Amino acid sequence: LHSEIGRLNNQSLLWGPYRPNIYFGTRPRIGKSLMTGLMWGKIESYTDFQHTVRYTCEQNEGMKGYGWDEYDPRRGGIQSIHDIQNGLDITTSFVKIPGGAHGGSWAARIKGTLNDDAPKDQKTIVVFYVSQEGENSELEAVPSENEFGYEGDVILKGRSEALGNYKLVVTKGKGVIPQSDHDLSRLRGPGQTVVQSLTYPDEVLWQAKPILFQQLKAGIDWLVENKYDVADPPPPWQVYLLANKPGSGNVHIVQKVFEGDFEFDILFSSESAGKEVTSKDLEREVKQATEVFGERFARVFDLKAPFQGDNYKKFGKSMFSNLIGGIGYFYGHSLVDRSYAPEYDEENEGFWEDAAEARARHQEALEGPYELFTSIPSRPFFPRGFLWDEGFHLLPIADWDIDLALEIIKSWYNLMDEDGWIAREQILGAEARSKVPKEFQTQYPHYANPPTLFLVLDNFVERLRKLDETLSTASVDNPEVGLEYLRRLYPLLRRQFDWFRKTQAGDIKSYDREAYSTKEAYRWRGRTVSHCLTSGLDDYPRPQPPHPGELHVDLMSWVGVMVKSLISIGSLLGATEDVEFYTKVLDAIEHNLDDLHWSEKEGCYCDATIDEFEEHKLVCHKGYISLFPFLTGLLKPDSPKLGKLLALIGDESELWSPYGLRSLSKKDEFYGTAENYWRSPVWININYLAIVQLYNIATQDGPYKETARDLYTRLRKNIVETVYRNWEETGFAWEQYNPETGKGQRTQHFTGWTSLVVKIMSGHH
Numbered sequence: 156l157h158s159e160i161g162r163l164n165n166q167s168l169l170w171g172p173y174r175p176n177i178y179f180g181t182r183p184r185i186g187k188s189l190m191t192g193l194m195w196g197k198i199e200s201y202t203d204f205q206h207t208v209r210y211t212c213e214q215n216e217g218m219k220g221y222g223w224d225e226y227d228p229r230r231g232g233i234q235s236i237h238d239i240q241n242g243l244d245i246t247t248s249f250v251k252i253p254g255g256a257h258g259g260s261w262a263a264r265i266k267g268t269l270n271d272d273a274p275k276d277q278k279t280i281v282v283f284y285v286s287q288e289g290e291n292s293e294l295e296a297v298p299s300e301n302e303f304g305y306e307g308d309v310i311l312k313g314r315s316e317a318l319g320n321y322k323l324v325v326t327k328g329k330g331v332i333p334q335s336d337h338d339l340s341r342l343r344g345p346g347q348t349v350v351q352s353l354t355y356p357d358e359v360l361w362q363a364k365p366i367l368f369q370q371l372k373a374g375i376d377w378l379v380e381n382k383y384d385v386a387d388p389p390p391p392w393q394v395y396l397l398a399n400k401p402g403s404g405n406v407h408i409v410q411k412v413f414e415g416d417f418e419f420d421i422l423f424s425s426e427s428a429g430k431e432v433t434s435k436d437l438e439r440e441v442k443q444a445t446e447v448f449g450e451r452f453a454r455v456f457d458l459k460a461p462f463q464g465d466n467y468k469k470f471g472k473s474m475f476s477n478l479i480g481g482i483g484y485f486y487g488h489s490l491v492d493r494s495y496a497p498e499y500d501e502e503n504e505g506f507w508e509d510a511a512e513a514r515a516r517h518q519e520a521l522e523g524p525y526e527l528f529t530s531i532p533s534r535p536f537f538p539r540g541f542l543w544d545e546g547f548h549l550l551p552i553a554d555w556d557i558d559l560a561l562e563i564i565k566s567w568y569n570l571m572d573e574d575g576w577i578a579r580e581q582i583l584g585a586e587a588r589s590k591v592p593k594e595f596q597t598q599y600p601h602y603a604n605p606p607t608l609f610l611v612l613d614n615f616v617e618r619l620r621k622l623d624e625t626l627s628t629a630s631v632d633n634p635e636v637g638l639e640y641l642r643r644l645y646p647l648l649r650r651q652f653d654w655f656r657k658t659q660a661g662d663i664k665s666y667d668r669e670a671y672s673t674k675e676a677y678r679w680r681g682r683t684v685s686h687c688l689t690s691g692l693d694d695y696p697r698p699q700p701p702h703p704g705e706l707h708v709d710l711m712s713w714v715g716v717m718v719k720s721l722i723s724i725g726s727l728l729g730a731t732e733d734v735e736f737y738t739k740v741l742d743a744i745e746h747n748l749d750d751l752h753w754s755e756k757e758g759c760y761c762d763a764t765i766d767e768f769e770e771h772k773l774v775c776h777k778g779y780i781s782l783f784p785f786l787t788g789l790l791k792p793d794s795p796k797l798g799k800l801l802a803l804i805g806d807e808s809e810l811w812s813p814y815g816l817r818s819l820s821k822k823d824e825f826y827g828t829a830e831n832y833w834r835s836p837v838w839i840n841i842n843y844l845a846i847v848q849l850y851n852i853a854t855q856d857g858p859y860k861e862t863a864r865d866l867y868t869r870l871r872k873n874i875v876e877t878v879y880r881n882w883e884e885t886g887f888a889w890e891q892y893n894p895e896t897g898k899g900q901r902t903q904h905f906t907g908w909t910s911l912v913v914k915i916m917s918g919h920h
């Protein structure tokens with residue numbers, strides 16, 4: 156029965172607008188298959204369209220904003236795009252229609268409305284670009300009756316092993332289509348929908364912009380050769396209209412020019428399903444998906460006081476939809492240094508210079524292919540999987556649809572190599588690579604990242620202990636399906652745990668170091684003079700200079716998170732021998748957190764190094780790092796140390812701002828220095844962990860119950876209101892927030908763990 160859910164999940168999830176790197180496109184969860192994408196741009200001159208055309212996501216002064224108003228990857232949703240440059244408010248509605256054997260059907264409506272500023276007679280070029288990869292697959296544009304192009308719909312018929320037979324229609328649409336009275340119209344037509352059917356080697360089909368422009372340039376070259384010139388030139392929009400040439404190929408460009416408002420549909424009909432998809436079908440499924448979305452949100456994300464107001468519901472729906480709407484399918488080779496150069500063991504003083512030397516060998520090479528199905532932090536700036544980010548992304552998503560979240564965990568775990576490594580940053584295929592400087596592509600098998608995905612697993616486990624609707628919870632409602640999932644994953648979890656212990660081990664046994672355990676001690680590999688990227692907290696201050704005897708309290712805590720998870724899941728599976736080992740590791744981490752990292756003098760946890768004199772030294776820098784054993788759920792509720800941390804947490808002159816907790820204390824000498832990334836600003840992911848843990852102390856008999864209850868109340872309020880106010884003013888989720896001004900800063904469209912705010916509002920942890 157397990158593989159029954161599995162099959163239904165696969166069929167449910169296969170199609171999606173799973174290209175969050177572009178404004179709008181579709182692809183299925185198959186490496187080499189059919190992909191679509193949308194392009195549009197005003198044209199007002201002979202040279203403007205190249206600068207105005209939109210395709211890949213960006214965020215600059217020319218774009219007011221854009222994002223998903225509703226979305227569920229099983230059903231589809233609606234996206235809004237507000238484009239200042241092209242004077243256009245666009246809606247793209249996408250809906251899936253279950254059926255047949257090939258993952259069903261889908262449909263999209265593209266609606267564009269000129270805004271108030273745009274010339275009412277604006278000419279907007281619109282392209283629907285379709286490509287198919289695979290050796291034994293075919294796709295063909297049925298030619299038009301009319302001479303120079305299409306008066307009605309464009310029908311592509313295609314076939315592949317993966318999709319069986321299918322038709323993809325781009326409808327005639329509604330809106331004025333301009334008409335040219337130039338001489339050229341005798342050869343090019345007065346103006347109509349056109350199709351070019353082309354073929355290129357499979358691996359470049361993703362390069363839609365250049366492919367398109369190469370075609371436009373050949374049309375213009377043809378104008379020149381054929382005596383169309385500046386003495387009497389055709390209008391711009393006709394100069395940029397491709398000559399109609401439909402046929403068969405692995406690329407099909409469908410182009411329309413509109414004057415004023417426009418709309419058209421795309422209907423993908425799987426032959427193996429019922430009858431084919433119509434526009435009436437699209438409208439009906441669109442209405443139905445909203446109703447369903449509406450009802451799930453109010454049940455799953457029931458906002459509690461003082462956020463019950465409709466303004467906060469709208470806010471929550473925006474933050475949620477953007478997070479789950481960023482879900483992508485990525486496919487291809489990634490770039491990995493597999494030298495395991497000895498310099499990467501970072502055993503010497505000065506190891507960062509050695510490691511640079513090894514990086515200068517450039518032994519990295521492409522490997523795979525791999526696939527990933529994942530949510531992403533940022534459509535415009537980093538539309539790809541990041542390992543500890545996904546732990547945060549899946550917490551609201553798991554509420555919504557636990558089976559989807561397990562899907563994404565499974566996809567991430569399927570990347571793990573034989574040693575237990577998963578690269579922190581998944582840049583799959585040339586399309587993904589295009590967005591990323593060559594110097595930052597290389598992944599390193601010695602680089603860890605926080606195992607925040609175990610948090611999602613912990614949530615799953617609690618739920619397991621205590622048709623699209625049915626499917627979304629199948630893995631918790633069917634206990635045996637749940638345990639079977641956990642059974643197949645468990646070895647990989649254990650693999651990762653061991654990998655942490657082998658690759659990120661700290662050195663106790665060879666300095667003057669006394670502690671309950673000789674084993675438990677950890678140091679993040681990959682540290683430079685000013686950075687520790689693998690920790691997730693890029694530039695939070697660490698011992699200077701970096702040193703092979705460093706120990707990092709955040710890393711030990713993460714290992715604590717992992718043991719606790721392995722205990723639960725191990726118990727569920729009866730791995731009795733494993734559970735006893737874990738039990739002793741936990742007990743050891745508990746003692747060793749204190750013996751190696753507790754500072755009585757400072758009242759908080761600290762990273763440690765070894766002195767110029769060769770002795771163990773704590774290096775205390777009050778901020779997120781300092782609260783780690785607390786944030787990761789490792790302290791007993793009665794713990795005096797906890798109490799001291801609650802004081803640090805609440806102290807306005809250290810961490811507590813009106814806007815959330817400061818990454819670093821105002822008292823720290825590194826406050827607001829250098830790039831100031833993790834050296835003062837307020838970060839929603841760490842604030843979320845604080846909030847969940849405060850709530851935990853607050854809902855149990857103990858000495859800090861009422862302190863935690865007050866801090867919980869205030870911090871929930873602070874964090875939610877800061878994120879909300881910024882969204883209200885700017886339309887955006889931001890990456891971090893300024894503790895002096897409350898302004899969002901760094902990157903916009905960060906959905907992205909900022910969206911945790913929906914879970915903070917809905918509460919009851």
Ligand SMILES: O=[N+]([O-])c1cc(-c2noc(C3CCC3)n2)ccc1NCCCCCCN1C[C@H](O)[C@@H](O)[C@H](O)[C@H]1CO
Pocket residue numbers: 214215532535536537541543544590691692693902
């Ligand atoms: O495309 N870009 O090169 C690019 C461009 C801009 C940019 N800003 O403005 C503009 C112009 C002017 C207006 C438009 N461009 C900003 C960033 C990037 N790329 C950075 C790649 C790595 C990001 C990691 C984020 N984050 C760090 C955290 O610390 C980790 O913890 C966490 O895991 C990780 C993932 O969330």
